[PDB]
Design an enzyme around this catalytic site. Structure first.
Site, PDB file in Angstrom:
ATOM      1  CD  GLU A 108      -2.405  -1.560   2.596  1.00  0.00           C
ATOM      2  OE1 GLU A 108      -2.249  -0.785   3.565  1.00  0.00           O
ATOM      3  OE2 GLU A 108      -2.901  -2.701   2.716  1.00  0.00           O
TER       4      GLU A 108
ATOM      5  CG  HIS B 121      -0.404   3.639  13.637  1.00  0.00           C
ATOM      6  ND1 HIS B 121      -0.683   4.905  13.168  1.00  0.00           N
ATOM      7  CD2 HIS B 121      -1.002   2.781  12.775  1.00  0.00           C
ATOM      8  CE1 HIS B 121      -1.414   4.817  12.071  1.00  0.00           C
ATOM      9  NE2 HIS B 121      -1.622   3.539  11.811  1.00  0.00           N
TER      10      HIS B 121
ATOM     11  CD  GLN C  99       0.261   2.292   4.890  1.00  0.00           C
ATOM     12  OE1 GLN C  99      -0.773   2.630   5.460  1.00  0.00           O
ATOM     13  NE2 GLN C  99       0.474   2.522   3.596  1.00  0.00           N
ATOM     14  CG  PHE C 100       1.688   1.021  10.662  1.00  0.00           C
ATOM     15  CD1 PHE C 100       1.070   1.650   9.586  1.00  0.00           C
ATOM     16  CD2 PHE C 100       2.469   1.783  11.526  1.00  0.00           C
ATOM     17  CE1 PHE C 100       1.227   3.017   9.372  1.00  0.00           C
ATOM     18  CE2 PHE C 100       2.635   3.151  11.322  1.00  0.00           C
ATOM     19  CZ  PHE C 100       2.012   3.769  10.242  1.00  0.00           C
ATOM     20  CB  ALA C 101       4.419  -4.790  12.849  1.00  0.00           C
ATOM     21  CG  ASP C 102       0.517  -1.964  14.830  1.00  0.00           C
ATOM     22  OD1 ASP C 102       1.529  -1.597  14.193  1.00  0.00           O
ATOM     23  OD2 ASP C 102       0.339  -1.701  16.040  1.00  0.00           O
TER      24      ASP C 102
ATOM     25  CD  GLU D  70      -3.491  -5.097   5.410  1.00  0.00           C
ATOM     26  OE1 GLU D  70      -4.668  -5.501   5.527  1.00  0.00           O
ATOM     27  OE2 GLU D  70      -3.204  -3.898   5.178  1.00  0.00           O
TER      28      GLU D  70
ATOM     29  CB  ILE E   7       0.989  -8.779  10.093  1.00  0.00           C
ATOM     30  CG1 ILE E   7       1.380 -10.056   9.345  1.00  0.00           C
ATOM     31  CG2 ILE E   7       0.703  -9.106  11.555  1.00  0.00           C
ATOM     32  CD1 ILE E   7       1.808  -9.818   7.913  1.00  0.00           C
TER      33      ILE E   7
END
Ligand SMILES: [Mg+2]
Ligand SMILES: [Mg+2]
Lengths: 323, 361, 362, 323
Positions: free
Chosen positions: D28, D128, D81-84, D59, D86
């Site tokens: 993204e 985040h 974009q953020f591990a959060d 994702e 996944i």
């Protein structure tokens, strides 16, 4: 009466549904089929399609809808056909369910239960054998329970249904009908967060739960024959786990072996082991030994070699005793 | 020649009395028509042999594909085996056979012997072949849809001229990954054909409780791609429509969603009990729609079938099954140590330690 | 009356000259019409206040909603606040305001003060209210869609007569959970209305790279439910189409998917920069489509608006904003210990131990 | 020359893409925008839309498509974009990516990289700030790497791209531009599976990685003022982790404190702690102490307190030292 785990679970659901109209069951094939493991058998016929509903094949829809139902007014008991299939609905579980109370400052709550068969030893290969409890225990906001006896099954499922906090309830499928134990027909619950002592001993502590109980108990019996007194502790609740029960036993015996069929790395038993080492170093006569599933996907051909054997557990007990 | 999209009635080319119903003239040689029938018989007999493997305990699990033969055989013939890629699911052993995967490998996987190129790593009904680009089956419903989209994107970027076909059941269309994967493939205009083998059930959950869209083909509107409703018990209709979608994909026109309406004659699996949630009238009604006798009548009317050939073909297939099973069993059990291989390209320190531990057992 | 589904041209009710284009009579009372305008101004002004909060370091993050006013205000008025439920996303503060959530609570959440009923647990733009059934915003895109479906199913089974509206952007429609949730709601004929606030962008990814379906409304075909393409800059079109979907849900006819085409005038967020991937000509073009001046003309053409009222309304709004911000700030910082509250109904042994540890450092 | 972690990561990508046409970037906002953290800045302009592609917001589509691309003929570097985030693609990661080689008997492979910003200290709230590495380490088949310096960022990302095994690559966002270090422009790689000795010491071992490095290093500095020499070991690779480096350090010092900002329960540091106890009990002069994130969702208001502080780390060090 004497009943299997399936019968005990079915009884728990029936009882709670008779007591509270808000209790509803949802999942794949839980209705007319009565569940692929018969846990919900007869409930649809007795309570109707508005309380026992077959859902589309989507774990995100199941877990998320259950969350929405719980936040609004119902007390859903969602079923994930196999613990291995919780992943498609993983974000719903960890991002919506687990964090609802916290992120809303307590304005919204999630009184829901997510039931799922788990564990290996059933020739299930990669996706009919997993024990993913670690994923749940690592997620703040989720209570996690794994039963191993028909008595605990009924008592803890009833407790979970009454608990306002989200509960992930794991049922080791190899134990669904492995034994018929006495289960009171009367209403009774068991405390979530409390371990159960299966055997008192003073030479070694065997910490375990769920799937591996059969082999652990067998190992304890064989140790007794050899003059070794092992204390067997079934944790039952993985989050929050019985810290006191664990530390009291290890303090008394000085040696501990933890057993589980879940993958070793960053597993739940690794958490308990690390905690024992951090808080009871001075009480340890031997290193905390872990007998776990290997760090590989669950194998089909080698199913019986992956699941901890009585031999593997005994070898670990020997290392702890001879240290 | 182009088939109509989102049709009210499922597309069919074989009449009830074996007549051709196509607008265009049939352009398949008699030899090819007989091959389609031969492959359907082989798939059906493979399925019946699986039933026997369960009864004798040679295998622990099977997913009856009886009723899916026209769909699976049509798909295998609409693509180029060994060139195009196939992303199948557990009930596609008929497709695997028609694609050319050796019975030795299919049965080897069912029995978990060294004949399985997948090394007995998974439970039965999880075949896979590098040689025939048959992406190894994974258990989670629809989990292979995004991967199929990715391979198609790769084919497009590398300009290989290949196509990726992805098969799944009706229940799979309810999973988020099914939707997410096709959406990406559609946006990229990737050469992928998504095919639903709709048997109207996901174990015991019927279509009505699976989705509210009247058809699966209608779901294609959500991706802006063509959707086709086909009679999956019609091997010719299935072949021609899938063929068209494949050609569209190959020439760079993007994905399509093809719904092949079929019926699951056996239970969901060896662990299921179909005769407990499905009306007998329905099953009996659909058993009369068996794709094999239906195509047999089509061939017979054209002088391409006779009782003697039926006998010779079935006897030939039985001999093939015997030989395949023998070679599979002959391969022997997979070594215990293989449980630690292929997790990674090479075994890390922890797997080496774990292997050594088990070896002392 | 029934709006046409899957129209090629977005549904409009307000003509460029202020003429009524409906094939049914306008039935809103003058008071309600003026309130729609009033709330759009309030939403716009709240957004502009947010820009100042960012600029002055009062809040760390904002998601500009300017351009979404007609859509958000219309939705707030198409339901019964406090009765029906709303499952919003981070850009819906205009909707939150129009729904009646106190500015003290909205700003308290933006500032993470004790004025936030969500206790400063999340970053800004994550409001939530039990009182107004405004399901606390969650960050993961579309993660609130399945819950919206579940709440609607509960409403149906419990016969509450409520409806659950679920809002999300265009990017959200590409997530698997978006599809999975709506599919279940549709199969159950649940009283849920799924509404897309389509601004043609998901941060920097444009609609064309987001999905291949010509519209989001077309996606309704995948669920067998009605899909509507609407001019989201037209407050009347947005209100009536959503209201019809709400009534449909309320009478037990199942969900609907309503696409409200709007435009994001500001950047994606205070952490983004729109003037980098969007052609100035596009932004300018849609700026001329501002829903506020458009509805103003509609009211003015009927003697339902004048400059004096305009000024009066604006002064009242800025006063409300000043009072709301003051209350939010005076509430005070949230205690450090609150970090351990609400994980569960009661704190387990490990959280009690962890709380004691932190206290050593305080 | 000196560069930030973002610049080093961008350089690594540019370098590998120039060397191998098969290397592609997808995710993204990675194209025209150059990434929300600018890691992919300029790559689309230089390599084209067939090498750098913005994807729909899914994702599952990103991870799964990456898997298919890798199995077929490309070497994709997917960005979450953020591990959060996944989680919506979690099943693709654990059921498809992680198990491909294993379940196929080695017939199909997944030479792909999944990079993602992670960690707290940036006021990111619940989604985040997460550090979900435990979820990956617990899943057999995935290599996991978390970098903390610009030099390592370039060397290890290049190594990951060349590695045939799937690699989840975590980039602590607080460290993206926190410091400008010397990063050679010449082609170099670093070994995956090997820890880095940040500072040698003999009184205490500080095991850490990623997000917490700043505080751990300053804590060692504070200890040095008191004459206590702390050995700081940045694991870098979490799976497979550097067993030898860890045990050699702990054997030397006899005392260890493990630090991470990931939640405590069933975390990766819990695994290392449990392993140290099981294998080196005889070498421990003090209990292995874990300083981790709390078992709560990541808080916005208390962000500064959730992330381990220098003080929290020092208090644990004192505990180990005075034992
Ligand atoms: Mg089916
Ligand atoms: Mg948008």
């Amino acid at each position: 009466a004497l009943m299997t785990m399936v019968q005990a679970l079915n009884r728990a659901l029936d009882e709670e549904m008779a007591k509270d109209p808000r209790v509803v069951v949802l999942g794949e094939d839980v209705g007319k089929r009565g569940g692929v493991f018969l846990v919900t058998e007869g409930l649809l016929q007795k309570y109707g399609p508005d309380r026992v509903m077959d859902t589309p094949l989507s774990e995100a829809a199941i877990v998320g809808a259950a969350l929405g139902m719980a936040a609004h007014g119902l007390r859903p008991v969602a079923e994930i056909q196999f613990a291995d299939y919780i992943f498609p609905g993983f974000d719903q579980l960890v991002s919506q369910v687990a964090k609802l109370r916290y992120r809303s400052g307590g304005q919204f709550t999630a009184p829901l239960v997510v039931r799922m068969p788990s564990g290996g030893g059933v020739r299930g290969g990669h996706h009919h054998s997993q024990s993913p409890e670690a994923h749940f225990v690592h997620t703040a906001g989720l209570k996690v329970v794994a039963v191993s006896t028909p008595y605990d099954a009924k008592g803890l499922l009833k407790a979970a249904i009454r608990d306002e906090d989200p509960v992930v309830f794991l049922e080791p499928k190899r134990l669904y009908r492995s034994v018929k134990e006495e289960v009171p027909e009367e209403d009774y619950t068991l405390p979530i967060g409390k371990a159960a002592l299966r055997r008192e001993g003073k030479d070694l502590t065997l910490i375990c739960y769920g799937t591996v109980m059969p082999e652990v108990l067998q190992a304890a019996a064989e140790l007794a024959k050899a003059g070794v007194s092992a204390e067997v502790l079934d944790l039952r609740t993985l989050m929050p786990w019985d810290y006191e029960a664990v530390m009291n036993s290890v303090a008394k015996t000085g040696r501990v072996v933890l057993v589980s069929d879940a993958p070793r790395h960053a597993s739940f038993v690794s958490e308990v082991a690390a905690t024992i080492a951090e808080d009871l170093l001075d009480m340890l006569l031997a290193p905390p030994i872990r007998v776990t599933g290997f760090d590989t996907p669950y194998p089909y051909a080698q199913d019986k070699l992956y699941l901890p054997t009585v031999t593997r557990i005994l070898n670990a007990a020997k290392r702890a005793l001879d240290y | 020649h182009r088939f109509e999209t989102f049709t009210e009635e499922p597309i069919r080319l074989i009449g009830e009395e074996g007549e051709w119903l196509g607008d265009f003239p049939l352009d398949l040689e008699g030899e090819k028509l007989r091959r389609l029938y031969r492959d359907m018989l082989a798939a059906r007999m493979l399925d019946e042999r699986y039933t026997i493997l369960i009864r004798t305990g040679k295998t622990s699990f099977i997913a009856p594909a009886a009723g899916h033969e026209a769909a699976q055989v049509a798909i295998a013939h609409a693509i180029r085996p060994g060139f195009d890629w196939v992303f199948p699911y557990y009930r596609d052993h008929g497709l695997a056979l028609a694609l050319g995967i050796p019975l030795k490998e299919l049965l080897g996987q069912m029995l978990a012997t060294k004949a399985d190129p997948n090394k007995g790593r998974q439970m039965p009904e999880h075949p896979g072949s590098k040689a025939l680009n048959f992406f190894t089956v994974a258990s989670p419903i629809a989990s292979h849809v995004p991967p199929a989209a990715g391979a198609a994107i790769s084919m497009k970027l590398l300009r290989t001229g290949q196509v990726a076909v992805c098969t799944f059941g009706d229940g799979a269309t309810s999973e988020g990954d099914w939707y997410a994967g096709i959406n990406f493939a559609a946006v990229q205009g990737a050469p992928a054909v998504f095919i639903a083998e709709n048997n109207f059930y996901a174990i015991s959950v019927d279509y009505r409780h699976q989705t509210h869209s009247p058809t699966i083909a209608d779901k294609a509107h959500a991706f802006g791609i063509p959707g086709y409703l086909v009679d999956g018990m019609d091997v010719l209709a299935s072949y021609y429509v899938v063929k068209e979608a494949v050609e569209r994909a190959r020439r760079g026109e993007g994905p399509s969603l093809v719904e092949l309406r079929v019926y699951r004659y056996g239970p969901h699996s060896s662990a299921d009990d179909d005769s407990r949630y499905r009306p007998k009238e329905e099953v009996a009604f659909w058993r009369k729609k068996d794709p094999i006798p239906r195509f047999r009548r089509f061939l017979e009317a054209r002088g391409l079938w006779n009782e003697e050939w039926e006998e010779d073909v079935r006897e030939e297939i039985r001999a093939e099954l015997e030989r395949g099973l023998k070679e599979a069993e002959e391969a022997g059990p997979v070594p215990p140590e293989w449980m630690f291989e292929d997790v990674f390209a090479e075994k890390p320190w922890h797997l080496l330690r774990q292997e050594a531990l088990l070896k002392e057992e």
